[PDB]
Amino acid sequence: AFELSAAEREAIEHEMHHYEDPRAASIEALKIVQKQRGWVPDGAIHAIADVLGIPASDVEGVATFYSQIFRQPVGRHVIRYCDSVVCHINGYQGIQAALEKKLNIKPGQTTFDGRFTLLPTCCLGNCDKGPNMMIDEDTHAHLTPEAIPELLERYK
Amino acid sequence: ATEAGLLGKNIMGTGFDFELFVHTGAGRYICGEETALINSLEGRRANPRSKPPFPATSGAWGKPTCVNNVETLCNVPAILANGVEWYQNISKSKDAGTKLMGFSGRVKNPGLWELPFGTTAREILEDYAGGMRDGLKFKAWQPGGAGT
Amino acid sequence: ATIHVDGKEYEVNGADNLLEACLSLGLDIPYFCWHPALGSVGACRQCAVKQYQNAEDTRGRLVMSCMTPASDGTFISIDDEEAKQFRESVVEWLMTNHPHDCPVCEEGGNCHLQDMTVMTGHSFRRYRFTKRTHRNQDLGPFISHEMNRCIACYRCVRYYKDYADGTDLGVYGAHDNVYFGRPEDGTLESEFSGNLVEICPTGVFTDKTHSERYNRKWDMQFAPSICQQCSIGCNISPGERYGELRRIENRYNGTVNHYFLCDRGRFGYGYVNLKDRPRQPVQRRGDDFITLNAEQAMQGAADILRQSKKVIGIGSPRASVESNFALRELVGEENFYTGIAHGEQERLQLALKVLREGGIYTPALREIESYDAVLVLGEDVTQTGARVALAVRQAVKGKAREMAAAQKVADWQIAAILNIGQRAKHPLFVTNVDDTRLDDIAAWTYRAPVEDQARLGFAIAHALDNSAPAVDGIEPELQSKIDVIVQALAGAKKPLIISGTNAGSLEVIQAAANVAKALKGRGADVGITMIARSVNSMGLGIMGGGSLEEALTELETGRADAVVVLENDLHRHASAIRVNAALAKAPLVMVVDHQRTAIMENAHLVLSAASFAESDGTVINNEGRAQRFFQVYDPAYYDSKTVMLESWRWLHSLHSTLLSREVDWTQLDHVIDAVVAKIPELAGIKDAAPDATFRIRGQKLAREPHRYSGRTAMRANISVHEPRQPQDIDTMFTFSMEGNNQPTAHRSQVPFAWAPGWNSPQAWNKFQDEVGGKLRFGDPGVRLFETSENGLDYFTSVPARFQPQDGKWRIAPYYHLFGSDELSQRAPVFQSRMPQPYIKLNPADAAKLGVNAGTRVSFSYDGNTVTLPVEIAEGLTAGQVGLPMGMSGIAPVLAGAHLEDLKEAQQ
Ligand SMILES: Cc1cc2nc3c(=O)[nH]c(=O)nc-3n(C[C@H](O)[C@H](O)[C@H](O)COP(=O)(O)O)c2cc1C
Ligand code: SF4
Ligand code: SF4
Ligand code: SF4
Ligand code: FES
Ligand code: FES
Ligand SMILES: [Mg+2]
Ligand SMILES: [Mg+2]
Ligand SMILES: [Mg+2]
Ligand SMILES: [Mg+2]
């Protein structure tokens, strides 16, 4: 069972009056609910749909369209490396290999215990600076396959 | 700027409200499109819209709307503050103004710089960006982002 | 308005897109995402045509037909090599991910994707890689779900959400992994979700009711028939195969239900395939039953009827114009009793009077989508006649179209029209005893008893004209709402008023009549629609009889010693105790019916009548449009011993055997002539369809596709010598393919839509003059009456305020789409869908007793002591109780009556 907390419901209701249409707060409501819990559970869809005033179908379409609104159980510290043209050139492949050799998983999976999900991301908009990756909200650039272990040991 | 009078109801004497908001969205590249950004801001799936009607006549919520990039909008303060002619004359190219240009890739000094919009691509690669680094040979290049 | 297509020069409406115009001209352009009812979106990219300029531009540019305005100086070319190659490659891209299952797809020879793949000339696979796959959902007991076959054309979502306002279906995912279904498994809530089976071009959404007993489209045998589950005349085309109704498909009618049906009419047809239907006239010789012949049955019935002191007849409001008449002739005009209660009839003839003698134009079902304001005063339009609810939903979106046309936006660009609207709608003020399904779009809903709704209507009609009767005592908080309704109706240029008979109140109907008269006196071209209970309810009101109460009074008195009940069950129009006590003391009870009702267990003779599927006649809908339905198949075929003649055929032959002593099985046209000769009010049913001997170039119209299969083997198990095809002397159709069904044929009764290259429902583009317009050569219907010069007076009778009585509970009618119809509820498919019986209660009155949310409750209305669960209804007014009308055990006649004692279940 799912029910919206008081803090996140209040934040959604405060976001709903930044726009002319309540619907417009849908992405921000999903991001609030995800911030609190790490992902958007199946009941959060209907809860947000009841708070805003739009159906659960629209909220579920918004949540499954965008790639940073997780609809499946994701660990903590959702690692997102970049694999686009500028990074492909700078060698993000070695960075992905040293990441999935240390986490012992494949891109798209949790590790064992609910920490260090591994995902690829479109581009982090920091191309001139080596292969990049974000862990949760910290952008890490100039990545070297030697410094992946020590950089992962900072997140517990 | 809100606390200092530069934003809010009565901005520096003249009657002009302009409340300013920020919308940090989820990660989809298609929301960068001019008329898919409008859909995403409306809280819907970021699907582009057919033109005409242009966003200028019917845009955000059926109201008029002009979508502008960041650098375009950063260009305007200097135009107004220094003058239209000064901006007209920065350099003798038919694309007036300055531009943020840079070289990415395995160059000796990647980054971006502000250039007079008539600079040869070789003048950015070897003078500013340094050139290919230590044993690498140039093969090709894309002018602009991926998609050119 | 003068385009050039491939050198040829045509004349088109310059106000619609190039796809619409080119399809109206007869040209062939492939298209998946365009629908003539859902506007144009450029999603699929499959209707590409090269566009030039200057008439000498040799290098045009590819552009989508459905999105270009088709203005005057337009030069295009459908056949350009580049356009051909792009259109072909566009289907190749769709075929990259398609599932190799045409043989097992529910719709082969009916699929639009097959049509367009053969049309674009693509019959070679260059793709080599894997296909994307998808898991299905459980959408209900009606329609299936196979997302492997989706081409992402967006028609389902556009229809279901932007058109029908569904709210429980959308699109999910992105980037070639897109998905169209419900957010979670569960049944689809929308009443009009059946139309997804033909809106979707592929076999993603296909109905289960036909998927169980399946047959390819060619094997089907169609005929133009009318939906019989509702007061509207939605034109259907039922298909038969191996002697049983397989499915009910939509039959275009540009004046009534252009492209869409209900679910009650599309899926509630399963009551004709029941294995307990009467198939031979049987006689009850004391306790035993003996099957009779046709001539034997007629001779016996006439011998018993000729010795009777008086014979009365009880026709029903679900027969046909002839069946009732035919009966009327059998018993005398005097002895014919309309099989509806007195109060059920008074407010039916009042609605008929408002439609005929009230000088206000009653719109057709498609003209409802053109009115500014709507006031649904007393009707649950969504549950009784639901296509009117969809029409209202289309009418409330009119303000977005006005805002778009004021900005020079074309009327086919639906995305821009919706974007400009931004949830701005025309005013709509629903009114009912509790919540409705039109509350999401209504501006204000009034939840009150059927007396307070009439008081509101009278208050509106007084605030509009100031000569109508005043209500004298409304309280100022409601006045501020009556004021908004008035300000919104008097300002609208085309208001509509939709009352009905289902509300169970005469005051509601006359209040709506007062509102409409005040508006007409103000100047606006106001329309008025009245929803009746059952198909052909209007025809029974036009013809008229005494009542059911008078018939039962004659029966339980020794005055009438015989009765012929025609297509009536008599238990949902009166008390099942009085009906049985009357029919018990009758030395003759004939029951001409096509179902196995309860009154035919003590019936001395049960003539096996025919259903709508295998019967001919005409039924008049709510606007007085006399439409004719045709026989789909011959019941006798596959079963030689099956005399299932039509009701009017039984009654005419019985009347003949009564006087003549010799049987006379007449023809449909003779019965129609008799009606139009004896009842002048129905003189318009003769023009509803051409009689027999109507031929198209000598040929008569065909009931089966040209390539109908299995002709010399489908009846081989019974006997290898195939019989002669059944003879249709009634109508202009033949029970074979040796007939004519061409788009350009000069007739307006189309059994099914097929054109060479267009197998699917999209073959209806070839049958209409301009796609989305009326059927070429008109639409099959004749309104019986036209608006009068002078209207009725104001009804100077305001009902007093509803004050609840202690110890009595006024029954508030709750109508359900599934289960509130006498015949649809019998379909074994609606048993899964219909709700469980209940009795709604106000919380203030549920807590007044000990009953809580689910506790059974016993109540007495008559002899019967029913016991139903309890649901809490917050919107229902205090001194009322809700009851599911029509649902078995609760007769719709229980609307406005008050049950005298209600208590806990007393377990
Ligand atoms: C697929 C696609 C992605 C785009 N992404 C961006 C973007 O990320 N940032 C941006 O400023 N413009 C982007 N654009 C261009 C915009 O549509 C728009 O022209 C621009 O943001 C504002 O117009 P301006 O360049 O005149 O200021 C994109 C266009 C397309 C077709
Ligand atoms: S949807 Fe049409 S094309 Fe696709 S498998 Fe079914 S019949 Fe064949
Ligand atoms: S499910 Fe059917 S109607 Fe919906 S997008 Fe797919 S093919 Fe089109
Ligand atoms: S609206 Fe009435 S007539 Fe039309 S399909 Fe539905 S039930 Fe049948
Ligand atoms: S491509 Fe990786 S930072 Fe841009
Ligand atoms: S029908 Fe025109 S783009 Fe699909
Ligand atoms: Mg603009
Ligand atoms: Mg048009
Ligand atoms: Mg499955
Ligand atoms: Mg399943």
Ligand SMILES: [Mg+2]
């Ligand atoms: Mg889903």
Ligand SMILES: [Mg+2]
């Ligand atoms: Mg389909």
Ligand SMILES: [Mg+2]
């Ligand atoms: Mg007759």
Ligand SMILES: [Mg+2]
């Ligand atoms: Mg017949």
